[PDB]
Design a protein that fits this description.
- 2 copies of one chain form a homodimer.
- The first copy, chain A, is α+β, with helices and mostly antiparallel strands.
- In chain A, 22% of the residues lie in helices and 27% in strands.
- Chain A contains 7 helices and 13 strands.
- In chain A, the strands form 2 sheets. Chain A has a 7-stranded antiparallel β-sheet, with no helix packed on it. In chain A, strands 8, 9, 10, 11, 12 and 13 form a 6-stranded mixed β-sheet that branches.
- In chain A, a hairpin with a 2-residue loop joins strand 6 and strand 7.
- In chain A, helix 3 runs parallel beside helix 5.
- The complex binds the ligand *C(=N)[C@H](C[C@@H]1CCNC1=O)NC(=O)[C@@H]1[C@@H]2[C@H](CN1C(=O)[C@@H](NC(=O)C(F)(F)F)C(C)(C)C)C2(C)C (2 copies).
- Chains A, B: It comes from Severe acute respiratory syndrome coronavirus 2.
- Chains A, B: This is 3C-like proteinase nsp5.
- Chains A, B: 3CL-PRO exists as monomer and homodimer. Only the homodimer shows catalytic activity. Interacts with host FBXO22; this interaction promotes the proteasomal degradation of nsp5.
- Chains A, B: It is found in: Host cytoplasm; Host Golgi apparatus; Host nucleus.
């Protein structure tokens, strides 16, 4: 019993974190095989970042301009190229600690662990959801860029995020491992706005099932609702519309508890309309939307790696 | 910016986890040097746990009765001894992945990372605080016993917890690596309840400094209180008494922000008596007490390991 925000064990990702320096700019890189992937703004100075032309900045750079440090060891960069907002550095050797991996582009609502690093060294690990407005609510300081987000499926590390920047409202933005930004953001030091953030509805229901499995059941009612009737109510509260696909994803949790998805929606509707009245759910006074249906199943059935 | 509950990178602890089976009872062990530490109830059958005579049960157990598995390799147990509630199985092979380590007993209020395991394999990582009632709010299932709590001091791993049991309200209990339980709990399936919990006041104040550091400054007021006047209000709300040692520990946070501890106490008093007025602090509608002042400093400085 008990329910916590839980990150994947990070040992496999730790063995891939290196330090990338270009001039006086230092950040992190991800060493897999003989390639190191890092944000392309490692080539900028403080002034370049206001309006960079990465193409010309990179032309003025050659192999001896990039220092890659793995532990106490310098890695010889024997090639470089630019793929979207990510820089690929060909190094003299393959990472002996390279795990089985893939690069994936995640959907909004999906979660991943972030291994926050500074100077190629791991500082901490925390769980993050890709918000519907394509930002994450993380914890990143100067030099954190290059820190990656990932998921583990038994032995395989699926990398999905690389940190690049922080937006005005304290939220964070970055790219997939191909350099494509999540959202309408650019790697330029200029005011940019993230859209209005909505609540991931399928995730709130998933967390309500986790609360039920843990014995937190005060919010359950003997009422029912239709999918349309629930959506008409929830949308006034800035909740994402719930679809038949989302109900199919909630199925294993529904079957395990014996509470139909639309029965749980009637409890969620009541919580939005009447509030929580000083009560808590899994120790929280707000409805939590950063656990996916899979995160609940994984935690409640002890999936190991 | 951004303040998140963060666990230590788990790589170092991952390499120390093994599986320990005795008869039909299977759980996790911690392999350091040529010794495997695990909870002593691994020798118990399902009926023994109601009223176990450990001294007697262990006398009827031999080295050959303990199966220890490190990956696909079975380790030969060449000796054993019972230290309080922990079993120490001497194996014929030192763990080549043994990091620099120490065993410590933590105090209530101090935090640690839990690497949760099943069958000797890591499933996830999260941060916990030793509550004033000596329980922890974790997430553990059947077979999670022997999973450990740890802190990392750059290169040294301080092991401070080993999971043994779960109490009625979904809260957990365990021992230090000497087998001594935190709290008044015993390792027997008998009626036990955690004493009424209190809020860790120094951790709440450290969390408000983290809020000011990140921009949430709405709760700051012109008022100032004494230590005595603060403590008379905290006790009403079930808060731990704030001592001069707690005030001294808060010193680095107070100096970085230029806000006196007793000026932050007036902010906390106002918050306890009159509420949060519909506002959040660091994305939370409740006052968080699981970040110690060292966690706030570590995260806000980007300390690496
Ligand atoms: C990479 N190490 C940092 C990480 C930032 C620093 C503070 N916390 C973070 O997440 N990335 C940057 O410094 C990027 C980088 C230039 C400026 N920058 C920003 O994150 C800035 N943000 C923006 O200009 C905005 F709002 F558009 F996102 C900053 C104001 C410094 C937070 C580049 C090339 C975008
Ligand atoms: C270790 N593998 C498990 C972890 C438990 C199982 C359910 N969730 C957990 O955290 N430990 C146990 O099964 C221990 C073990 C016997 C009984 N047990 C308990 O934790 C039980 N609790 C109590 O006896 C109580 F109420 F006193 F705290 C249980 C009812 C199974 C939760 C021993 C030797 C204590």
């Amino acid at each position: 019993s008990g329910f916590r925000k839980m990150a994947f064990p990070s040992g496999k990702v730790e063995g891939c974190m290196v330090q990338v320096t270009c001039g006086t700019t230092t950040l992190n890189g991800l060493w897999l095989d003989d390639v190191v992937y890092c944000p392309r703004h490692v080539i900028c100075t403080s002034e370049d970042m206001l309006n960079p032309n990465y193409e010309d900045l990179l032309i003025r750079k050659s192999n001896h301009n990039f220092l890659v440090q793995a532990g106490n060891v310098q890695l010889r960069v024997i090639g470089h190229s630019m793929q979207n907002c990510v820089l690929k550095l060909r190094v003299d050797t393959a990472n002996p600690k390279t795990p089985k991996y893939k690069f994936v582009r995640i959907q909004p609502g999906q979660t991943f662990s972030v291994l926050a690093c500074y100077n190629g060294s791991p500082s901490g690990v925390y769980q993050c959801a890709m918000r519907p407005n394509f930002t994450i609510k993380g914890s990143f300081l100067n030099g954190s860029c290059g820190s990656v987000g990932f998921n583990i499926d038994y032995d395989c590390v699926s990398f999905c995020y690389m940190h690049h920047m922080e937006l005005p409202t304290g939220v964070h933005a970055g790219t997939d491992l191909e350099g494509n930004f999540y959202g309408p953001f650019v790697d330029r030091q200029t005011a940019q706005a993230a859209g209005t953030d909505t609540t991931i509805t399928v995730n709130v229901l998933a967390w309500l099932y986790a609360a039920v499995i843990n014995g937190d059941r005060w919010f359950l009612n003997r009422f029912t609702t239709t999918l349309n009737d629930f959506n008409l109510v929830a949308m006034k509260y800035n909740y994402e519309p719930l679809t038949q696909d989302h109900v199919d994803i909630l199925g294993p949790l529904s079957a395990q508890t014996g509470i139909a998805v639309l029965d749980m929606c009637a409890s969620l509707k009541e919580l939005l309309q009447n509030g929580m009245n000083g009560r808590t759910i899994l120790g929280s006074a707000l409805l939590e939307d950063e656990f996916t249906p899979f995160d609940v199943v994984r935690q409640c059935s002890g999936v190991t790696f």
